[PDB]
Write a protein that binds this ligand. Structure first.
Ligand SMILES: CCCCCCCCCCCCCCCCCC(=O)OC[C@H](COP(=O)([O-])OCC(O)COP(=O)([O-])OC[C@@H](COC(=O)CCCCCCCCCCCCCCCCC)OC(=O)CCCCCCCCCCCCCCCCC)OC(=O)CCCCCCCCCCCCCCCCC
Ligand SMILES: CCCCCCCCCCCCCCCCCC(=O)OC[C@H](COP(=O)([O-])OCC(O)COP(=O)([O-])OC[C@@H](COC(=O)CCCCCCCCCCCCCCCCC)OC(=O)CCCCCCCCCCCCCCCCC)OC(=O)CCCCCCCCCCCCCCCCC
Ligand SMILES: CCCCCCCCCCCCCCCCCC(=O)OC[C@H](COP(=O)([O-])OCC(O)COP(=O)([O-])OC[C@@H](COC(=O)CCCCCCCCCCCCCCCCC)OC(=O)CCCCCCCCCCCCCCCCC)OC(=O)CCCCCCCCCCCCCCCCC
Ligand SMILES: CCCCCCCCCCCCCCCC(=O)OC[C@H](COP(=O)(O)O)OC(=O)CCCCCCCCCCCCCCC
Ligand SMILES: COCCOCCOCCOc1ccc(C(C)(C)CC(C)(C)C)cc1
Ligand SMILES: COCCOCCOCCOc1ccc(C(C)(C)CC(C)(C)C)cc1
Ligand SMILES: COCCOCCOCCOc1ccc(C(C)(C)CC(C)(C)C)cc1
Lengths: 48, 56, 54, 324, 370, 65
């Protein structure tokens, strides 16, 4: 008889996708488009 | 292990349910209760003997 | 004033270089390659290059 | 490893982690926390030198005060005991304060340069001229708790405020000195109330609601407990003896143990118990006996006071008070 | 209002409860075997995965590679089907002077080659059969996994001196023995061989003192008690009431801990069903640790370890103290401080007071008698 | 009779553990919304001044002008 708002298994399954990220999983996956279309390579060359 | 070779074999199957392993849990509570039982039986026998002596 | 502290092994340095060499060995383990399809242009002397085999 | 002591460890565990075991606590194990501090001393100031007070000198002074003698004899006996204790401590190697960091007795002042008369490099005080037989107590006293880890000064901005919250005192927007004074005034009130209860005939003369309110004031009971009368009386005796020692840190350590309540996530659990409520008596509290600190990882069981020799003789006052 | 005989019933109840707890908590979740959870272990290999379902795998001495053969170096992963089981084979520690290669049927084998395992010809088949490793073709080793001895808590011993006395009570408490006493004292001439005694014996005083000794031995036998000493009933009821209160408080503390054990077991039931439990949802089922852990968070000191090394000095220097159970290596001693107390009492008291106390006890016995 | 040192939950006991987890993982969720917004904010941006610019973008904060 749990007295707390039990969270469903599917909701935990979805939140695990968001909280099971690693540092490299952020750094490289977001840095590759950033470095390519950023102030270094493309946008920088264009705008300067 | 084969002639001129060693290998590591991994199965490929989805695990539908967890695998259970009986790792017995050490706890002092059962022995606590058994000690209580023995001490209470000692005191009960003591009371019975004392009643037998005092009345007989 | 005279605390008499014993040596703490956690403050020593006997694992950093071994760990770095472990990381580098893990790196170089992925450089292992087969003989088939192998080709590397050596220098004019016949000696290997630096960047080539890596 | 740099700050705690390895001999107070088991007492520390029994005082702070008894909400894990569910076992009762012994107040003497909370008194063991004073081992972090030094020896609390009392220097009586005389016309010559200060003298450290001892149990023997205090016993003699209480005996002389009880004899109800003329003051010409009272002061003479007091000064006799005083010079005796002075000689005793001079043989001991001076007072305890001489070799304690942060305190100290200065030696004779030095003579500088040409004022130095050959080998006499010192200048004794005026009182050195007075003969030692004229040693008289000035009526001035200096209490030195020697609290190196327990002192209320070193507590901090947060611990004092939380102690005043826990004792339901004013705490906001004030220095720790003012909250210290508020805490000491509350402490004095509780001691005076204990004295008046002892004059009025102890705890048993009180009602149930009055004792409940007293324990609420002492902060050892919460209203969601519904204890018995014997348990309430034992709790009062415990904290009364503990507050007789005049130390707020150990008082708060004792009090906070009775305010560790949990909430379960399930409705069925915890189940309804089968045993009756916990009951005690004033006899179960061991105050008249010393208890050595248990060695680390070698705790000893609790001996009831009744098992001690001559316990029916020692507890005869409490026995008469309870049976009556 | 709680007699002492009612205690073992409570003990039985709590034993049933803690056994229902421990039969669940004895179970634990093993290592995960789902391939979907470990497919990236093979994705990240130093070589691409070989989906091999045709041809043969052969070991042959080191040197020139046959053109067309796919080398299988250490670290090579191979997806196959073995006896109907889809498997991944990871190559580890190929022997020296030898190498292993996958030979498709188009590729001719070299000399001195040893077919380690081969596949059948099934081109029309959509789902290939793979291989069949016969007994002797491949030595597969199952890990032994020797289940060590179950950690048993040491039972402390309890000397029951009164059980022999209860047996003696059961022996003496008979009607026949009293009937024999009744018919022996009234007619003891029947038992003894008096005609032979008077025949051989030259002085009748010997036979008379013999019968006068047997009479006294019988009167002493019937009038003796079950016990060999005079127990002081007051001190025994004192120890009984003290021990009773200590036992009730012990049972209350054990019920207090059993509540947390049947909470950890009610939570472990869900973990055994395969349900994922949050770390903090799981911490809520440990309320006493949850509170102290929340306060450590409020203070903001995430460090730990010297507190453990001070509270449990047997762990000092042990960095992996958390992954062990040394409670059996460090148990509370069974020493009774009462022995040291009575010893200090005897050391302080003189001997004439000890003999006086024996007199106080004797006079108290006569007082209870009168 | 109930077991001691136990009570029902109260408002000052704070939120449950599952609620604390739901509080913790909100930044991790907004990460997925903000990093693409960061990349879009950088990519759809235009410089504010040039050698030919007679004007510069002004932003009156309090409408005083
Ligand atoms: C608003 C509410 C006002 C009501 C009073 C505030 C609360 C009561 C209180 O603060 O007690 C007064 C406080 C007593 O502190 P305490 O409770 O006794 O604690 C001492 C414990 O031993 C200490 O125990 P603890 O260790 O647990 O507490 C430590 C705590 C102790 O600190 C505190 O006491 C903070 C108390 C909160 C004060 C609230 C300030 C809010 C400001 C907004 C009339 C005033 C006229 C003058 C005004 C201009 C100064 O923290 C600190 O030690 C750091 C304090 C300093 C922080 C700011 C440092 C800025 C550095 C900037 C860089 C400098 C670089 C240059 C370097 C040059 C080269 C050397 O005494 C005073 O500060 C002066 C009293 C009169 C004025 C008080 C208000 C203004 C001054 C503050
Ligand atoms: C200088 C300070 C020297 C002495 C410090 C001692 C002290 O002030 O005690 C305050 C005292 C704090 O409580 P406590 O002494 O620790 O005892 C608490 C009890 O044990 C009961 O404890 P409890 O746990 O049951 O809590 C009771 C509860 C309920 O407390 C109540 O009794 C009712 C709530 C009264 C709120 C009064 C504050 C109103 C603030 C202005 C709001 C706007 C007004 C309208 C628009 C203008 O407390 C509250 O909810 C909030 C109380 C604190 C409110 C802030 C008071 C400001 C004091 C000024 C010095 C600090 C700023 C520097 O405040 C009160 O509880 C009574 C009201 C005090 C009226 C004093 C009037 C003089 C105000 C001077 C203003 C200075 C402003 C400067 C910055 C601008
Ligand atoms: C930003 C995050 C929020 C800011 C909050 C800061 C609060 C400031 C404060 O209260 O000062 C008192 C506080 C000392 O007060 P206290 O005597 O210990 O008593 C605590 C309150 O009574 C404890 O509060 P309370 O339990 O009495 O609750 C009532 C309080 C709480 O309510 C509120 O204060 C705000 C209401 C909205 C939030 C409610 C959420 C629930 O509201 C009031 O009525 C009094 C507040 C005025 O001062 C400090 O601790 C110093 C910290 C601030 C200075 C740090 C350095 C500042 C930068 C220096 C620049 C120059 C350096 C060179
Ligand atoms: C002759 C012309 C040049 C040669 C031929 C054409 C170029 C061919 C090469 C390939 C195309 C290059 C495109 C160049 C675009 C450009 O100019 O780049 C710069 C421009 C913006 O520059 P300006 O705003 O200054 O004009 O950016 C874009 O075009 C937006 C592209 C969006 C790309 C998103 C890619 C996402 C990949 C998935 C990553 C997932 C990780 C999570 C991240 C959210
Ligand atoms: C000589 O080294 C050059 C490599 O440097 C690359 C810089 O990368 C930035 C950070 O990259 C990471 C990402 C994750 C991590 C780990 C996996 C260790 C993160 C952790 C501790 C959360 C698991 C470490 C470094
Ligand atoms: C010449 O350079 C010497 C500088 O020495 C640096 C020492 O620090 C080494 C840190 O390197 C790591 C990185 C990751 C890890 C592990 C394997 C623990 C990461 C983890 C948590 C992802 C498994 C361990 C050590
Ligand atoms: C995070 O920090 C770890 C990064 O380490 C990078 C080290 O970089 C050097 C690796 O480059 C090489 C160099 C030589 C070689 C091989 C050529 C060792 C020589 C060989 C294969 C012929 C024996 C392989 C890779």
């Amino acid at each position: 008889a749990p007295l707390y708002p039990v969270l469903s298994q599917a909701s935990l399954y979805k939140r695990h996708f968001f909280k099971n990220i690693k540092l490299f999983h952020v750094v490289f996956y977001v840095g590759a488009p950033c470095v390519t279309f950023g102030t270094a390579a493309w946008s920088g060359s264009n705008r300067n | 292990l084969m002639n001129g070779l060693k290998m590591r074999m991994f199965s490929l199957a989805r695990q539908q349910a967890p695998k259970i392993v009986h790792k017995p849990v050490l706890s002092p509570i059962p022995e606590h209760l058994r000690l209580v039982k023995n001490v209470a039986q000692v005191q009960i026998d003591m009371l019975k003997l004392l009643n037998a002596q005092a009345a007989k | 004033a005279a605390p008499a502290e014993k040596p703490d092994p956690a403050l020593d340095a006997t694992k950093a270089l071994p760990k770095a060499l472990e990381e580098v060995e893990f790196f170089q383990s992925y450089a292992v390659r087969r003989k088939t399809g192998f080709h590397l242009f050596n220098r004019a002397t016949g000696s290997p290059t630096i960047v080539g085999p890596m | 490893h740099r700050l705690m002591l390895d001999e107070v460890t088991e007492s520390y565990k029994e005082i702070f982690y008894s909400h894990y075991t569910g076992q009762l606590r012994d107040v003497r194990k909370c008194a063991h926390l004073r081992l972090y501090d030094g020896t609390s001393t009392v220097l009586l100031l005389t016309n010559k030198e200060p003298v450290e007070l001892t149990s023997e000198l205090l016993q003699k002074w209480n005996a002389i005060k009880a004899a109800k003698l003329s003051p010409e004899e009272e002061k003479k006996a007091r000064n006799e005991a005083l010079i005796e204790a002075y000689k005793e401590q001079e043989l001991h190697g001076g007072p305890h304060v001489k070799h304690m960091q942060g305190y100290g007795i200065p030696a004779d002042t030095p003579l500088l340069g040409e004022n130095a008369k050959g080998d006499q490099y010192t200048q004794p005080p005026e009182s050195a001229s007075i003969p030692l037989e004229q040693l008289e107590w000035t009526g001035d006293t200096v209490f030195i708790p020697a609290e190196y880890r327990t002192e209320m000064e070193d507590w901090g901005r947060e611990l004092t405020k939380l102690a005043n919250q826990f004792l339901l005192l004013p705490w906001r927007f004030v220095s720790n000195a003012w909250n210290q004074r508020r805490l000491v005034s509350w402490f004095e009130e509780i001691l005076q109330e204990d004295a008046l209860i002892a004059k009025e005939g102890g705890v048993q003369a009180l009602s149930d609601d009055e004792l409940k309110v007293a324990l609420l004031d002492r902060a050892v009971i919460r209203c969601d407990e519904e204890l018995t009368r014997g348990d309430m009386e034992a709790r009062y005796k415990e904290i009364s003896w503990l507050m007789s020692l005049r130390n707020p840190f150990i008082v708060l350590a004792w009090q906070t143990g009775y305010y560790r309540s949990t909430y379960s996530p399930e409705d069925d659990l915890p189940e309804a118990s089968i045993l009756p409520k916990l009951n005690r008596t004033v006899l179960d509290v061991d105050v008249h006996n010393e208890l050595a600190p248990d060695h680390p990882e070698k705790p000893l069981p609790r001996v009831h006071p009744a098992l001690y020799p001559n316990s029916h003789l020692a507890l005869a006052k409490e026995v008469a008070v309870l049976a009556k | 209002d709680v007699p002492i005989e009612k205690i073992p019933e409570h003990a039985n109840v709590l034993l049933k409860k803690i056994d229902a707890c421990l039969e669940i908590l004895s179970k634990d979740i093993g290592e995960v075997t789902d391939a979907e959870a470990h497919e990236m272990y093979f994705e990240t290999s130093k070589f691409q995965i070989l989906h091999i379902y045709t041809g043969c795998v052969a070991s042959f001495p080191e040197g020139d590679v046959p053109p067309g053969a796919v080398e299988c170096l250490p670290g090579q992963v191979i997806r196959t089907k073995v006896n109907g089981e889809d498997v991944m084979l990871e190559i580890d520690e190929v022997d020296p002077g030898y190498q292993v290669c996958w030979f498709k049927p188009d590729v001719p084998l070299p000399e001195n080659a040893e077919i380690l395992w081969s596949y059948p010809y099934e081109p029309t088949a959509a789902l290939p059969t793979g291989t069949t490793w016969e007994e002797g073709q491949a030595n597969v080793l199952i890990p032994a996994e020797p289940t060590p001895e179950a950690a048993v808590w040491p039972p402390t011993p309890v000397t029951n001196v009164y059980a022999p006395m209860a047996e003696k009570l059961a022996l003496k408490s008979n009607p026949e023995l009293k009937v024999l006493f009744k018919e022996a004292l009234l007619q003891p001439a029947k038992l003894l061989p008096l005609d032979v005694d008077y025949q051989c014996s030259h002085d009748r005083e010997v036979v008379e003192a013999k019968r006068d000794r047997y009479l006294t031995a019988l009167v002493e036998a019937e009038q003796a008690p079950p016990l060999p000493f005079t127990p002081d009933v007051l001190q025994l009821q004192l120890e009984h009431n003290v021990l009773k209160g200590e036992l009730i408080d012990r049972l209350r503390a054990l019920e207090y801990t059993i509540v947390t054990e049947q909470l950890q077991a009610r939570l472990h039931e869900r973990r055994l069903r395969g349900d994922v439990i949050d770390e903090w949802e799981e911490l809520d089922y440990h309320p006493l640790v949850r509170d102290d852990t929340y306060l450590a968070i409020d203070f903001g000191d995430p460090t730990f370890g010297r507190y453990i090394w001070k509270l449990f000095p047997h762990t000092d220097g042990d960095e992996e103290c958390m992954f062990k159970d040394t409670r059996l290596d460090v148990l509370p001693p069974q020493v009774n401080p009462l022995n040291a107390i009575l010893a200090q009492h005897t050391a302080q008291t003189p001997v004439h007071r000890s003999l006086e106390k024996r007199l106080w006890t004797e006079v108290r016995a006569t007082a209870v008698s009168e | 009779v109930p077991v001691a040192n136990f009570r029902p939950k109260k408002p000052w006991d704070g939120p449950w553990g599952i609620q604390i987890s739901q509080k913790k993982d909100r930044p991790f969720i907004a990460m997925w919304i903000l990093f693409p917004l960061l990349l879009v904010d950088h990519l759809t941006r235009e410089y504010y001044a040039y050698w030919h610019s007679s004007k510069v973008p002004v932003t009156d904060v309090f409408g005083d002008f």
